[PDB]
């Protein structure tokens, strides 16, 4: 039995009425021979790739065929709050909502997913995610690999776990509210360890970490380099050669990799230094997909220069906004203890010696109900407040750079922090200047026991009724309060 081929999402463009139709629905998938209920856009699992063009408007008709409410957020796309599809963007079960997207940002790979209040983790875990391919005038002149599904492929990497009966085994509980929902099965565009046949020359991979909570670190099995050409918000100024590529939850990178005749190799993910994430099989490099070379010449180029990145402006005089992330200490400690009890020392493999200590310290954490004050559902916070959909925390300026300072000092958990309505520039990532491939346009920044600072500008309105979100993209943290709303 050979490896299945890598599924290729349909690249979906507008009709004559300038409409794209997305249906959200429940179906079935098979994983290792067992059927599971799964959810998808225009299918059973995952979704299509919606193709957009800078300066053109399209209308998307969104049909919710689930039996529960949902929303549809365009992660990475700079659009008004009204069409942003945050938690206020409710689509009733059996109903339809239409949005018009007036695309005005550079070429990039973005994505889309649910943003249902308190339930985003579950709805993503059930299968909802799709892709957005934005093109502009500039990018096509570069003559990059561009044959969709051949030498230009999306690679959506996600973990899941399943119960004995085959169903997706998702829970938002005290453990997952602390450390995230993660599993033992890695999916690549919904398939387990697929192969992709690619022509000789350059192969472009549009990588998305679509995991709820698991950070990833891409590399190749034979140590051939990856050439990073794009981050969340578009092209870098020039390619950046790397041996390994860390990718946080919700982040995208586009890379070129060389394909040579007769030498198959795997894309792999390397063990990460994140609590819970190095349990077998993830204690060792884990294959993501095999690349099978085809002896046909691939036409794409790796240009010396890709785009022009503007200089960072002067910081003096810019509004500063503080966003202090926090976790309830008691519930954080409880969740961590549950993780250690379940998996043992391995749940801290690869962490620092200071943190590591899982020594004599398994004291009795109580199991009685002490009321809503101690409910994990609102344990995670920004500026001392669990997300309140009725109360945006502030109004940001429109068309002005601001400096946002996001702190995770006070706990050791990983918080990939995401801000709607913008592509920003990272000034400091967790207390260090950003790596070259992370110095361009980003919509996510790492916050882990330290402080990050980003330079952000909002070009579109967001009223109180359809506010922008800023949140941790570890989805179980978001769902248990680590989110705020803001207006523009
Ligand atoms: Cu997102
Ligand atoms: Cu977003
Ligand atoms: Cu977090
Ligand atoms: Cu969001
Ligand atoms: O998001």
For residue 488, CA distances in Å to 246, 351, 383, 390, 419 come to: 32, 40, 19, 16, 13
Q: Which two tokens stand for residue 456?
A: 């952000």
* Resolution for this experimental structure (Å): 1.1
Q: Which ligand sits closest to the CA of 130?
A: 1
Which residue CA neighbors atom 1 of ligand 5 most closely?
75
Give the sheet arrangement for strand 380-382, strand by strand.
380-382, 320-327, 402-407, 451-456, 425-428
Burial degree of 465 (CB within 10 A; 0-12, 13-18, 19+) = exposed
Q: Which ligand sits closest to the CA of 478?
A: 3
Q: Which two tokens stand for residue 358?
A: 């899982």
Helices (H), 136-261: 137-141, 174-179
How many CB atoms sit inside 10 A of residue 68's CB? 12
Task: Report the chain's terminal Cα–Cα distance, integer Å.
Answer: 55
Going from the Cα of 473 to the center of ligand 3, the distance in angstroms, rounded, reads 7
What is the dihedral sign for C-alpha 327, 331, 337, 342? negative
Pairing status of strand 185-188 against strand 152-160: antiparallel
Rounded to the nearest angstrom, the gap between the alpha carbon of residue 174 and the centroid of all alpha carbons in its chain is 23
Distance CA 189, CA 317 (A): 45
Distance CA 441, CA 435 (A): 12
Q: Is 420 in the pocket of ligand 5 (CB under 6 A)?
A: no
Are the C-beta atoms of 72 and 22 separated by less than 8 Å?
Answer: yes
Going from the Cα of 316 to the center of ligand 4, the distance in angstroms, rounded, reads 29
**Is residue 340 helix, strand or coil?**
helix
Query: In the chain, how many H helices and how many E strands?
Result: 7, 29
- Examine domains 1-135 and 308-488 and report if their fold is the same: yes
For residue 97, CA distances in Å to 83, 133, 186, 214 come to: 10, 22, 33, 32
Going from the Cα of 253 to the center of ligand 5, the distance in angstroms, rounded, reads 17
CB under 5 Å of ion ligand 4: residues: 469
Per DSSP, the residues of 52-80 read: EETT-EEEEEEEE-SSS-B--EEET----
Binding-site residues for Cu cation: 73, 75, 113, 115, 415, 418, 420, 471-473, 477
Are the C-beta atoms of 215 and 383 separated by less than 8 Å?
Answer: no
CA angle 68, 420, 183 (to 5 degrees): 55
Experimental method of this PDB entry: X-ray
**Is residue 228 helix, strand or coil?**
strand
CATH fold of 136-307 reads Immunoglobulin-like (2.60.40)
| Residue bearing tokens 């578009």 | 234
Q: What are φ and ψ of residue 354, in 5° steps?
A: -55, -45
Distance CA 209, CA 253 (A): 9
Binding-site residues: 73, 75, 113, 115, 415, 418, 420, 471-473, 477
DSSP state of 91: B
Are the C-beta atoms of 20 and 98 separated by less than 8 Å?
Answer: no
Per DSSP, the residues of 373-427 read: GG-GGG-EEETTB---TT--SEEPPBSS-EEEEEE-TT----EEEEETT--BEEE
Going from the Cα of 478 to the center of ligand 4, the distance in angstroms, rounded, reads 8
Q: Is 73 in the pocket of ligand 5 (CB under 6 A)?
A: yes
For residue 45, CA distances in Å to 7, 52, 115 come to: 11, 22, 17
Q: Dihedral of the CA atoms 450, 456, 462, 466 (nearest 10)?
A: -30
Distance CA 251, CA 418 (A): 9
CB under 5 Å of ion ligand 2: residues: 75, 420
Q: Which two tokens stand for residue 365?
A: 């954490």
- Domain 1-135 superfamily per CATH: Cupredoxins -  blue copper proteins (2.60.40.420)
Q: Is 477 in the pocket of ligand 5 (CB under 6 A)?
A: no
Q: What are φ and ψ of residue 346, in 5° steps?
A: -60, -25
CATH fold of 308-488 reads Immunoglobulin-like (2.60.40)
Distance CA 351, CA 358 (A): 11
Distance CA 138, CA 201 (A): 23
Q: Is 51 in the pocket of ligand 5 (CB under 6 A)?
A: no
Going from the Cα of 115 to the center of ligand 3, the distance in angstroms, rounded, reads 16
Going from the Cα of 242 to the center of ligand 3, the distance in angstroms, rounded, reads 27
Domain ranges of the chain: 1-135, 136-307, 308-488
Q: Which of 229, 217, 323, 232 is nearest to 268 (CA)?
A: 217
Q: Is 418 in the pocket of ligand 5 (CB under 6 A)?
A: yes
């Amino acid at each position: 039995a050979e490896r299945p081929t890598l599924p290729i999402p349909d690249l979906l463009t507008t009709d004559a009425r300038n409409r794209i139709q997305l249906t959200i629905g429940a179906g079935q998938s098979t994983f290792g021979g067992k059927t599971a209920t799964t959810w998808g856009y225009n299918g059973n699992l995952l979704g299509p790739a919606v193709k957009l063009q800078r300066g053109k408007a399209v209308t998307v008709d969104i049909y919710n065929q689930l039996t529960e409410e949902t929303t549809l957020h365009w992660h990475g796309l700079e659009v008004p709050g009204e069409v942003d599809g945050g938690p206020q963007g409710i689509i009733p079960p059996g109903g339809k909502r239409s949005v018009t997207l007036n695309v005005d940002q550079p070429a990039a790979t973005c994505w889309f997913h649910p943003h249902q209040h308190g339930k985003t983790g579950r709805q993503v875990a059930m299968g909802l995610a799709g892709l957005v391919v934005i093109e502009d005038d500039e990018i096509l002149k570069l003559m990059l690999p561009k044959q969709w599904g051949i030498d230009d492929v999306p690679v959506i990497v996600q973990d899941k776990k399943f119960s004995a009966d085959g169903q997706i085994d998702y829970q938002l509980d005290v453990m997952t509210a602390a450390v995230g929902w993660f599993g033992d099965t890695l999916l690549t565009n919904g398939a387990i360890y697929p192969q992709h046949a690619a022509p000789r020359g350059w192969l472009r991979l549009r990588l998305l970490n679509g995991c709820n909570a698991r950070s990833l670190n891409f590399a190749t099995s034979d140590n051939r380099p990856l050439y990073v050409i794009a981050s969340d918000g578009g092209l870098l100024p020039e390619p950046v050669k790397v041996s390994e590529l860390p990718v946080l939850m919700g982040e995208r990178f586009e890379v070129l990799v060389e394909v040579n005749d007769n030498k198959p190799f795997d894309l792999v993910t390397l063990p990460v230094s994140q609590m819970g994430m190095a349990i077998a099989p993830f204690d060792k490099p884990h294959p993501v997909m095999r690349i099978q070379p085809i002896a046909i010449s691939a036409s794409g180029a790796l240009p010396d220069t890709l785009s022009s990145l503007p200089a960072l402006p002067s910081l003096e005089g810019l509004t500063v906004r503080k966003l202090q992330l926090s976790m309830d200490p008691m519930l954080d400690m409880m969740g961590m203890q549950m993780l250690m009890e379940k998996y043992g020392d391995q749940a801290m493999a690869g962490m620092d010696h200071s943190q590591m200590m899982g020594h004599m310290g398994h004291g009795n954490m109580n199991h009685m109900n002490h009321g809503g004050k101690f409910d994990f559902h609102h344990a995670n916070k920004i500026n001392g407040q669990a997300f309140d959909m009725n109360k945006p925390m502030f109004a940001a300026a429109k068309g002005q750079y601001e400096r946002w300072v996001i702190s995770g000092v006070g706990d050791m958990m990983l918080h990939p922090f995401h801000i709607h309505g913008t592509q920003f520039r990272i000034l400091s990532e967790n207390g260090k200047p950003p790596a070259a491939h992370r110095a361009g346009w980003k919509d996510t920044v790492k916050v882990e026991g330290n402080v990050s600072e980003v330079l952000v500008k909002f070009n579109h309105d967001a009223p109180k009724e359809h506010a922008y979100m800023a949140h941790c993209h570890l989805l179980e943290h978001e769902d248990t309060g680590m989110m705020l709303g803001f207006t523009v």
